[PDB]
Amino acid sequence: ATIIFAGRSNVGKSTLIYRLTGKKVRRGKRPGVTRKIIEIEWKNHKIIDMPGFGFMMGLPKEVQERIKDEIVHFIEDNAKNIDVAVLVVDGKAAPEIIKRWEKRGEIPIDVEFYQFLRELDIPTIVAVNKLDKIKNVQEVINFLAEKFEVPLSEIDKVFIPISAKFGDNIERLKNRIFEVIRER
Ligand SMILES: Nc1nc2c(ncn2[C@@H]2O[C@H](COP(=O)(O)OP(=O)(O)O)[C@@H](O)[C@H]2O)c(=O)[nH]1
């Protein structure tokens, strides 16, 4: 199966991919891949990893938009060959970023992207990372579910809190990914 990973920069996506696969990606061995899509062999499956969305110092905002366009085009073009998507979010930061963006009338990246995947009928699991920094995870997940337009009945199927840093619930996230792939 093919699994795409996506998320804003610094949410812990490359760390999560390493916890899941034992393969270090985006650590510099390969320079010039910072703004590119990479493929990872995960036993007999394939992970296609999108460059992180959003701001990164040194990354001009025009290049930021270009990257986002490239990710959109790849996922639109390969949608029929994508079995499941994992959107990695930073559980501590995401709700507060969503609130400040809505205040100024902009659509938060996380919300925009999860809703985009839904328009494409791609089953999506949200890895709510950095659980070790989150004092009320249920509250965070309930907030994100309302902003992402996720039905109450589907919250526990969609939102999986983990700590890629310490390993918390990584096996549960792996089980979910494979369960979604099979159920598909
Ligand atoms: N506290 C905490 N920090 C994390 C976790 N996962 C990743 N990080 C930290 O978040 C930063 C970015 O992680 P990285 O995997 O390089 O992010 P990416 O840009 O989304 O690939 C780092 O300093 C990681 O140590 C986590 O679960 N908990």
mmCIF file of N, CA and C in Angstrom, residues 61-153:
data_model
loop_
_atom_site.group_PDB
_atom_site.id
_atom_site.type_symbol
_atom_site.label_atom_id
_atom_site.label_comp_id
_atom_site.label_asym_id
_atom_site.label_seq_id
_atom_site.Cartn_x
_atom_site.Cartn_y
_atom_site.Cartn_z
ATOM 1 N N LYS A 61 8.214 33.012 1.576
ATOM 2 C CA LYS A 61 6.830 32.598 1.546
ATOM 3 C C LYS A 61 6.326 32.222 0.147
ATOM 4 N N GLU A 62 6.986 32.695 -0.915
ATOM 5 C CA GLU A 62 6.593 32.368 -2.302
ATOM 6 C C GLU A 62 6.963 30.904 -2.572
ATOM 7 N N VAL A 63 8.038 30.431 -1.955
ATOM 8 C CA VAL A 63 8.502 29.092 -2.184
ATOM 9 C C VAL A 63 7.634 28.168 -1.361
ATOM 10 N N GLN A 64 7.220 28.683 -0.217
ATOM 11 C CA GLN A 64 6.301 27.999 0.682
ATOM 12 C C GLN A 64 5.009 27.699 -0.114
ATOM 13 N N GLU A 65 4.457 28.703 -0.801
ATOM 14 C CA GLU A 65 3.239 28.484 -1.597
ATOM 15 C C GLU A 65 3.509 27.541 -2.761
ATOM 16 N N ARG A 66 4.682 27.651 -3.365
ATOM 17 C CA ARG A 66 4.983 26.779 -4.503
ATOM 18 C C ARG A 66 5.022 25.320 -4.065
ATOM 19 N N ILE A 67 5.623 25.102 -2.914
ATOM 20 C CA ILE A 67 5.714 23.767 -2.343
ATOM 21 C C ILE A 67 4.318 23.222 -2.088
ATOM 22 N N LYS A 68 3.467 24.039 -1.471
ATOM 23 C CA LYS A 68 2.114 23.625 -1.186
ATOM 24 C C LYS A 68 1.404 23.226 -2.485
ATOM 25 N N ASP A 69 1.623 23.989 -3.565
ATOM 26 C CA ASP A 69 1.017 23.681 -4.874
ATOM 27 C C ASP A 69 1.484 22.363 -5.435
ATOM 28 N N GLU A 70 2.756 22.070 -5.233
ATOM 29 C CA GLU A 70 3.375 20.847 -5.710
ATOM 30 C C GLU A 70 2.796 19.616 -4.992
ATOM 31 N N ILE A 71 2.584 19.756 -3.681
ATOM 32 C CA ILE A 71 2.018 18.697 -2.818
ATOM 33 C C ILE A 71 0.583 18.474 -3.278
ATOM 34 N N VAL A 72 -0.159 19.547 -3.491
ATOM 35 C CA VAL A 72 -1.564 19.472 -3.945
ATOM 36 C C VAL A 72 -1.638 18.748 -5.277
ATOM 37 N N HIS A 73 -0.770 19.132 -6.200
ATOM 38 C CA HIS A 73 -0.761 18.521 -7.515
ATOM 39 C C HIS A 73 -0.392 17.022 -7.434
ATOM 40 N N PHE A 74 0.619 16.684 -6.664
ATOM 41 C CA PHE A 74 0.964 15.276 -6.525
ATOM 42 C C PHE A 74 -0.217 14.482 -5.940
ATOM 43 N N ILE A 75 -0.785 14.986 -4.852
ATOM 44 C CA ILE A 75 -1.895 14.208 -4.227
ATOM 45 C C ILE A 75 -3.139 14.144 -5.126
ATOM 46 N N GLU A 76 -3.445 15.229 -5.803
ATOM 47 C CA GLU A 76 -4.576 15.176 -6.739
ATOM 48 C C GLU A 76 -4.263 14.153 -7.827
ATOM 49 N N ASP A 77 -3.068 14.192 -8.384
ATOM 50 C CA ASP A 77 -2.727 13.273 -9.499
ATOM 51 C C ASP A 77 -2.580 11.792 -9.153
ATOM 52 N N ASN A 78 -2.179 11.528 -7.929
ATOM 53 C CA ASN A 78 -1.962 10.170 -7.457
ATOM 54 C C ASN A 78 -3.037 9.693 -6.471
ATOM 55 N N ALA A 79 -4.110 10.462 -6.296
ATOM 56 C CA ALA A 79 -5.141 10.103 -5.325
ATOM 57 C C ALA A 79 -5.635 8.663 -5.437
ATOM 58 N N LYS A 80 -5.886 8.193 -6.650
ATOM 59 C CA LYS A 80 -6.364 6.811 -6.799
ATOM 60 C C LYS A 80 -5.360 5.761 -6.360
ATOM 61 N N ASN A 81 -4.107 6.178 -6.162
ATOM 62 C CA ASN A 81 -3.049 5.259 -5.764
ATOM 63 C C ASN A 81 -2.503 5.553 -4.394
ATOM 64 N N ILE A 82 -3.290 6.290 -3.601
ATOM 65 C CA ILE A 82 -2.920 6.587 -2.240
ATOM 66 C C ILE A 82 -3.920 5.872 -1.335
ATOM 67 N N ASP A 83 -3.445 4.925 -0.547
ATOM 68 C CA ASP A 83 -4.380 4.187 0.301
ATOM 69 C C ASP A 83 -4.818 4.848 1.597
ATOM 70 N N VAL A 84 -3.909 5.579 2.214
ATOM 71 C CA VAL A 84 -4.248 6.292 3.436
ATOM 72 C C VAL A 84 -3.294 7.448 3.594
ATOM 73 N N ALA A 85 -3.718 8.506 4.286
ATOM 74 C CA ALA A 85 -2.901 9.671 4.536
ATOM 75 C C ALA A 85 -2.756 9.853 6.037
ATOM 76 N N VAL A 86 -1.555 10.211 6.470
ATOM 77 C CA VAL A 86 -1.343 10.535 7.877
ATOM 78 C C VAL A 86 -0.980 12.014 7.946
ATOM 79 N N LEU A 87 -1.846 12.814 8.567
ATOM 80 C CA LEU A 87 -1.534 14.214 8.745
ATOM 81 C C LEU A 87 -0.989 14.309 10.168
ATOM 82 N N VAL A 88 0.259 14.755 10.289
ATOM 83 C CA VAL A 88 0.890 14.933 11.601
ATOM 84 C C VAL A 88 0.644 16.352 12.052
ATOM 85 N N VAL A 89 0.109 16.550 13.258
ATOM 86 C CA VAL A 89 -0.086 17.893 13.818
ATOM 87 C C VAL A 89 0.595 17.952 15.145
ATOM 88 N N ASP A 90 0.893 19.180 15.571
ATOM 89 C CA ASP A 90 1.568 19.395 16.844
ATOM 90 C C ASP A 90 0.366 19.680 17.771
ATOM 91 N N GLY A 91 0.030 18.714 18.633
ATOM 92 C CA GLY A 91 -1.144 18.850 19.503
ATOM 93 C C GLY A 91 -1.115 20.062 20.434
ATOM 94 N N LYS A 92 0.078 20.427 20.890
ATOM 95 C CA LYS A 92 0.186 21.640 21.749
ATOM 96 C C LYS A 92 -0.025 22.929 20.960
ATOM 97 N N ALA A 93 0.683 23.108 19.844
ATOM 98 C CA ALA A 93 0.557 24.332 19.089
ATOM 99 C C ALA A 93 -0.661 24.540 18.195
ATOM 100 N N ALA A 94 -1.086 23.478 17.526
ATOM 101 C CA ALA A 94 -2.177 23.532 16.553
ATOM 102 C C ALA A 94 -3.436 24.235 16.952
ATOM 103 N N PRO A 95 -3.951 23.972 18.172
ATOM 104 C CA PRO A 95 -5.187 24.696 18.501
ATOM 105 C C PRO A 95 -4.975 26.216 18.660
ATOM 106 N N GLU A 96 -3.799 26.619 19.152
ATOM 107 C CA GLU A 96 -3.577 28.030 19.377
ATOM 108 C C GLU A 96 -3.286 28.713 18.059
ATOM 109 N N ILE A 97 -2.629 28.007 17.125
ATOM 110 C CA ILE A 97 -2.388 28.582 15.809
ATOM 111 C C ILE A 97 -3.741 28.760 15.107
ATOM 112 N N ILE A 98 -4.614 27.759 15.227
ATOM 113 C CA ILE A 98 -5.910 27.842 14.555
ATOM 114 C C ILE A 98 -6.651 29.076 15.037
ATOM 115 N N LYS A 99 -6.653 29.313 16.338
ATOM 116 C CA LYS A 99 -7.363 30.474 16.882
ATOM 117 C C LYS A 99 -6.815 31.844 16.389
ATOM 118 N N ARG A 100 -5.485 31.962 16.274
ATOM 119 C CA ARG A 100 -4.946 33.248 15.831
ATOM 120 C C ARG A 100 -5.179 33.463 14.339
ATOM 121 N N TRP A 101 -5.157 32.394 13.553
ATOM 122 C CA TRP A 101 -5.411 32.537 12.138
ATOM 123 C C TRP A 101 -6.884 32.885 11.895
ATOM 124 N N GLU A 102 -7.782 32.234 12.617
ATOM 125 C CA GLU A 102 -9.196 32.531 12.409
ATOM 126 C C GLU A 102 -9.429 33.974 12.809
ATOM 127 N N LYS A 103 -8.830 34.422 13.920
ATOM 128 C CA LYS A 103 -8.974 35.825 14.328
ATOM 129 C C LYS A 103 -8.685 36.758 13.165
ATOM 130 N N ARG A 104 -7.628 36.513 12.398
ATOM 131 C CA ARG A 104 -7.363 37.426 11.298
ATOM 132 C C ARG A 104 -7.977 37.096 9.943
ATOM 133 N N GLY A 105 -8.938 36.180 9.972
ATOM 134 C CA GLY A 105 -9.640 35.775 8.770
ATOM 135 C C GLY A 105 -8.908 34.910 7.781
ATOM 136 N N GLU A 106 -7.958 34.101 8.228
ATOM 137 C CA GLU A 106 -7.236 33.226 7.307
ATOM 138 C C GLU A 106 -7.578 31.788 7.689
ATOM 139 N N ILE A 107 -7.472 30.896 6.711
ATOM 140 C CA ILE A 107 -7.798 29.506 6.933
ATOM 141 C C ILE A 107 -6.525 28.837 7.403
ATOM 142 N N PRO A 108 -6.540 28.271 8.627
ATOM 143 C CA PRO A 108 -5.322 27.597 9.133
ATOM 144 C C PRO A 108 -4.920 26.447 8.194
ATOM 145 N N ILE A 109 -3.607 26.291 8.019
ATOM 146 C CA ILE A 109 -3.070 25.253 7.137
ATOM 147 C C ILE A 109 -3.593 23.839 7.487
ATOM 148 N N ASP A 110 -3.589 23.500 8.748
ATOM 149 C CA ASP A 110 -4.033 22.165 9.150
ATOM 150 C C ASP A 110 -5.475 21.853 8.776
ATOM 151 N N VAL A 111 -6.323 22.869 8.941
ATOM 152 C CA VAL A 111 -7.743 22.747 8.657
ATOM 153 C C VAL A 111 -7.909 22.654 7.126
ATOM 154 N N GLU A 112 -7.232 23.533 6.420
ATOM 155 C CA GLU A 112 -7.302 23.562 4.978
ATOM 156 C C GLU A 112 -6.882 22.227 4.417
ATOM 157 N N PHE A 113 -5.780 21.678 4.932
ATOM 158 C CA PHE A 113 -5.296 20.411 4.382
ATOM 159 C C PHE A 113 -6.150 19.185 4.701
ATOM 160 N N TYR A 114 -6.613 19.068 5.919
ATOM 161 C CA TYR A 114 -7.475 17.940 6.246
ATOM 162 C C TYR A 114 -8.751 18.026 5.385
ATOM 163 N N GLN A 115 -9.267 19.232 5.186
ATOM 164 C CA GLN A 115 -10.487 19.321 4.399
ATOM 165 C C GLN A 115 -10.225 19.053 2.945
ATOM 166 N N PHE A 116 -9.006 19.359 2.495
ATOM 167 C CA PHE A 116 -8.644 19.080 1.117
ATOM 168 C C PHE A 116 -8.617 17.541 0.920
ATOM 169 N N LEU A 117 -7.985 16.821 1.837
ATOM 170 C CA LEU A 117 -7.943 15.368 1.698
ATOM 171 C C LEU A 117 -9.357 14.782 1.669
ATOM 172 N N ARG A 118 -10.280 15.410 2.400
ATOM 173 C CA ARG A 118 -11.667 14.887 2.431
ATOM 174 C C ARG A 118 -12.330 15.090 1.079
ATOM 175 N N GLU A 119 -12.070 16.208 0.420
ATOM 176 C CA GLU A 119 -12.603 16.442 -0.939
ATOM 177 C C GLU A 119 -12.057 15.409 -1.885
ATOM 178 N N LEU A 120 -10.875 14.872 -1.595
ATOM 179 C CA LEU A 120 -10.279 13.854 -2.473
ATOM 180 C C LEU A 120 -10.594 12.399 -2.113
ATOM 181 N N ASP A 121 -11.402 12.211 -1.084
ATOM 182 C CA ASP A 121 -11.870 10.905 -0.580
ATOM 183 C C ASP A 121 -10.706 10.041 -0.110
ATOM 184 N N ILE A 122 -9.677 10.692 0.442
ATOM 185 C CA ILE A 122 -8.554 9.931 0.945
ATOM 186 C C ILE A 122 -8.694 9.714 2.449
ATOM 187 N N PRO A 123 -8.792 8.451 2.907
ATOM 188 C CA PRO A 123 -8.913 8.160 4.343
ATOM 189 C C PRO A 123 -7.712 8.836 5.032
ATOM 190 N N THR A 124 -7.986 9.579 6.104
ATOM 191 C CA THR A 124 -6.925 10.320 6.777
ATOM 192 C C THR A 124 -6.870 10.077 8.257
ATOM 193 N N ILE A 125 -5.684 9.785 8.768
ATOM 194 C CA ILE A 125 -5.505 9.624 10.218
ATOM 195 C C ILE A 125 -4.741 10.863 10.668
ATOM 196 N N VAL A 126 -5.154 11.490 11.764
ATOM 197 C CA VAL A 126 -4.419 12.627 12.276
ATOM 198 C C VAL A 126 -3.565 12.149 13.427
ATOM 199 N N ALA A 127 -2.238 12.207 13.277
ATOM 200 C CA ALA A 127 -1.320 11.833 14.365
ATOM 201 C C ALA A 127 -1.164 13.115 15.218
ATOM 202 N N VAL A 128 -1.697 13.119 16.434
ATOM 203 C CA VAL A 128 -1.620 14.293 17.294
ATOM 204 C C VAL A 128 -0.333 14.138 18.124
ATOM 205 N N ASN A 129 0.726 14.739 17.614
ATOM 206 C CA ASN A 129 2.044 14.563 18.176
ATOM 207 C C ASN A 129 2.353 15.535 19.294
ATOM 208 N N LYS A 130 3.401 15.187 20.017
ATOM 209 C CA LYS A 130 3.926 15.950 21.167
ATOM 210 C C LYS A 130 2.988 15.823 22.351
ATOM 211 N N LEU A 131 2.424 14.636 22.473
ATOM 212 C CA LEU A 131 1.491 14.411 23.555
ATOM 213 C C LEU A 131 2.070 14.742 24.940
ATOM 214 N N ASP A 132 3.386 14.574 25.057
ATOM 215 C CA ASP A 132 4.078 14.835 26.307
ATOM 216 C C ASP A 132 4.022 16.320 26.732
ATOM 217 N N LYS A 133 3.599 17.204 25.838
ATOM 218 C CA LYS A 133 3.514 18.641 26.132
ATOM 219 C C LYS A 133 2.059 19.057 26.352
ATOM 220 N N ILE A 134 1.130 18.121 26.140
ATOM 221 C CA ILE A 134 -0.299 18.429 26.204
ATOM 222 C C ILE A 134 -0.960 18.051 27.509
ATOM 223 N N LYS A 135 -1.437 19.060 28.234
ATOM 224 C CA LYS A 135 -2.109 18.837 29.510
ATOM 225 C C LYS A 135 -3.517 18.262 29.377
ATOM 226 N N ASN A 136 -4.273 18.612 28.334
ATOM 227 C CA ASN A 136 -5.624 18.034 28.181
ATOM 228 C C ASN A 136 -5.798 17.566 26.746
ATOM 229 N N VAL A 137 -5.343 16.359 26.490
ATOM 230 C CA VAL A 137 -5.387 15.848 25.138
ATOM 231 C C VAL A 137 -6.799 15.672 24.612
ATOM 232 N N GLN A 138 -7.735 15.225 25.446
ATOM 233 C CA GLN A 138 -9.106 15.070 24.989
ATOM 234 C C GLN A 138 -9.686 16.381 24.496
ATOM 235 N N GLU A 139 -9.363 17.446 25.211
ATOM 236 C CA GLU A 139 -9.828 18.766 24.854
ATOM 237 C C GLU A 139 -9.207 19.186 23.546
ATOM 238 N N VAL A 140 -7.923 18.864 23.329
ATOM 239 C CA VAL A 140 -7.279 19.268 22.071
ATOM 240 C C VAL A 140 -7.942 18.535 20.880
ATOM 241 N N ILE A 141 -8.108 17.240 21.042
ATOM 242 C CA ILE A 141 -8.703 16.412 19.996
ATOM 243 C C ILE A 141 -10.150 16.830 19.741
ATOM 244 N N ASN A 142 -10.888 17.237 20.766
ATOM 245 C CA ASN A 142 -12.265 17.644 20.519
ATOM 246 C C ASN A 142 -12.281 18.931 19.748
ATOM 247 N N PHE A 143 -11.338 19.832 20.052
ATOM 248 C CA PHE A 143 -11.261 21.110 19.351
ATOM 249 C C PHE A 143 -10.921 20.877 17.873
ATOM 250 N N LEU A 144 -9.904 20.047 17.625
ATOM 251 C CA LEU A 144 -9.469 19.787 16.272
ATOM 252 C C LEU A 144 -10.577 19.090 15.504
ATOM 253 N N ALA A 145 -11.316 18.202 16.157
ATOM 254 C CA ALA A 145 -12.380 17.494 15.449
ATOM 255 C C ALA A 145 -13.432 18.494 14.969
ATOM 256 N N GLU A 146 -13.795 19.464 15.814
ATOM 257 C CA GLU A 146 -14.776 20.461 15.416
ATOM 258 C C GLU A 146 -14.217 21.340 14.257
ATOM 259 N N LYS A 147 -12.939 21.738 14.326
ATOM 260 C CA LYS A 147 -12.383 22.604 13.278
ATOM 261 C C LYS A 147 -12.164 21.879 11.943
ATOM 262 N N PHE A 148 -11.850 20.588 12.022
ATOM 263 C CA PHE A 148 -11.598 19.769 10.815
ATOM 264 C C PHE A 148 -12.912 19.170 10.232
ATOM 265 N N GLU A 149 -14.044 19.417 10.894
ATOM 266 C CA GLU A 149 -15.362 18.881 10.465
ATOM 267 C C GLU A 149 -15.399 17.361 10.510
ATOM 268 N N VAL A 150 -14.935 16.837 11.638
ATOM 269 C CA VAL A 150 -14.916 15.416 11.926
ATOM 270 C C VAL A 150 -16.080 15.101 12.858
ATOM 271 N N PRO A 151 -16.966 14.170 12.442
ATOM 272 C CA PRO A 151 -18.125 13.787 13.262
ATOM 273 C C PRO A 151 -17.701 13.191 14.608
ATOM 274 N N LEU A 152 -18.470 13.466 15.647
ATOM 275 C CA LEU A 152 -18.143 12.900 16.970
ATOM 276 C C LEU A 152 -17.926 11.386 16.919
ATOM 277 N N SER A 153 -18.761 10.674 16.163
ATOM 278 C CA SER A 153 -18.664 9.215 16.041
ATOM 279 C C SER A 153 -17.335 8.758 15.449
#
